[PDB]
Every structure is written in C-alpha cells, then in structure tokens.
C-alpha cells in the first residue's frame, strides 16, 4: 500500500 508515495 505505497511505501514511498509521490503525490
């Protein structure tokens, strides 16, 4: 569930 979200 997204470890490093880019927005």
């Amino acid at each position, epitope marked *: 569930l997204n*470890p*490093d979200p880019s*927005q």
Partner: antibody, heavy 116, light 108 residues
Framework: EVQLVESGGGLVQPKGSLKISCAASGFTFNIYAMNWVRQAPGKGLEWVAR??????????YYADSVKDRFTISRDDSQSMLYLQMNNLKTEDTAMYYCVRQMGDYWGQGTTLTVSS | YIQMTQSPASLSVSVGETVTITCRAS??????LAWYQQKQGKSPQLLVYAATNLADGVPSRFSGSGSGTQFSLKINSLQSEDFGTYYCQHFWGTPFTFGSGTKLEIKR
C-alpha cells in the same frame, strides 16, 4: 512484527552535536519513505524531517526551525535511519521519534536534553 | 503552509458515551490525513489513515470521516482504554503539521 528501535539520545551542551539512530526490522526498509518526529516534554508532536527511498533519489525534507542544522540520512545496507544534529538549541530538547512512511509505525523514542 | 486547528482542547467523557473530535485544515488537503492516539508515557499509534480508513488492530468504534478541509474522528461507546491524547496530521506537502491535541479524560 515491524519494529523501529531508537538510540543515541542523552545530555548535550547547547551548541553541541549528537547523532541519534533508528534500527529497523520486520519490513523491507529500502522501499519505504522514513521520517523523524519530535515531542518536547508536555507539548505536542512536531514533524522534523523526512527521507524518500533509493528509487526516488533519497530526496529529503526538513522543518524550518531545524533546516541547515539537522541532516537526516539512511544506511539501507544495515536498515538504519539517522539524524545528525549540529548546533543544538534549548528548544530542541525533546523525545525524538522514528516514524515509518506516513505514520503507521512509530519507535519508542530516545530523549534529547539540551542544557548547560 | 497548511495549519491544522484541532477542537476541543480537552474532553471529559463517561464510559459508553460517544464523542467526536474535529480537525480543520487551513487549505484543501484532500484526504491526506491521519488520526493518532497517544497515551501519556507512550508513543503515538495510528488510528485512521487517508481520513476515512480504520488502521489494523483498532476497534470498530473508531470512525474517520471527511475530505477537503473539515475532518472529524468519532468514537462510539468510548471504552475505558480510549483515554489519552488524540492528534491529527496532514501529509499534503512538507511540513506535515500536527493538530494541537485533544486531551481525553474518563468521567468517574
């Protein structure tokens, strides 16, 4: 389970330096964004700094009161998160938290005390 | 920078009573918001992520709702264990600022 253990905290003379640490295990460290959060005694939670994963070029974010003075880093080889704190001020006295991603897991904290 | 203003500062609450802590964002933060429960002497624990999603190992009585600017956590039939300080955080652009806190006490 997922665990983050903080260490390194202690008494530091104002205008001094300390490098607090965070050891991670039970999850794939190198794919996660990581951050530090602080809490002054009796006060609320203040976000300090963040660092993105290797795949996103390790891009870093800081708080205005901490910028140029604190540098967040990570050793992916050892699953370690660090906070170098230079030129410490009194208002930097706090419990420092190592937090994963957007806040699903927090460590137990080390205390920092800035006092002469 | 986006300011989050939390209300109320403190709550005195009887067991089985239901309560709602609200959190308003200065600007539109969409759904990038989390709720935390901290107990004195301990580290915070994630209660709701993305404004409306209940986190693992959190009782069903905890309800997250809201989008845009006005968010609110709701507790149904507050249990003795639900004592603590409740914080909200947004994550729409650095710095990810926190609420000022809601101190929750058990009525006795």
């Amino acid at each position: 389970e997922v665990q983050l253990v903080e260490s390194g905290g202690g008494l530091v003379q104002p205008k001094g330096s300390l490098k607090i640490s965070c050891a991670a295990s039970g999850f794939t460290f190198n794919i996660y964004a990581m951050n530090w959060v602080r809490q002054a005694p009796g006060k609320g939670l203040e976000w300090v700094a963040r660092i993105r994963s290797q795949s996103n070029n390790y891009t870093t974010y800081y708080a205005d009161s901490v910028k140029d003075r604190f540098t967040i880093s990570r050793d992916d080889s050892q699953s370690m998160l660090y906070l170098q704190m230079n030129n410490l001020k009194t208002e930097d006295t706090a419990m420092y938290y190592c937090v994963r991603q957007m806040g699903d897991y927090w460590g137990q904290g080390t205390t920092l005390t800035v006092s002469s | 920078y986006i300011q989050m203003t939390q209300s109320p500062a403190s709550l005195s609450v009887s067991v089985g009573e239901t309560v709602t802590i609200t959190c308003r964002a200065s600007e539109n933060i969409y759904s990038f918001l989390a709720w935390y429960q901290q107990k004195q002497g301990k580290s915070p624990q994630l209660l709701v992520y993305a404004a409306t999603n209940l986190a693992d190992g959190v009782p069903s009585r905890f309800s997250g709702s809201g989008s845009g600017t006005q968010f609110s956590l709701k507790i149904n039939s507050l249990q003795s264990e639900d004592f603590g300080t409740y914080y909200c955080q947004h994550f729409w652009g650095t710095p990810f600022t926190f609420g000022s806190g809601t101190k929750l006490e058990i009525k006795r």
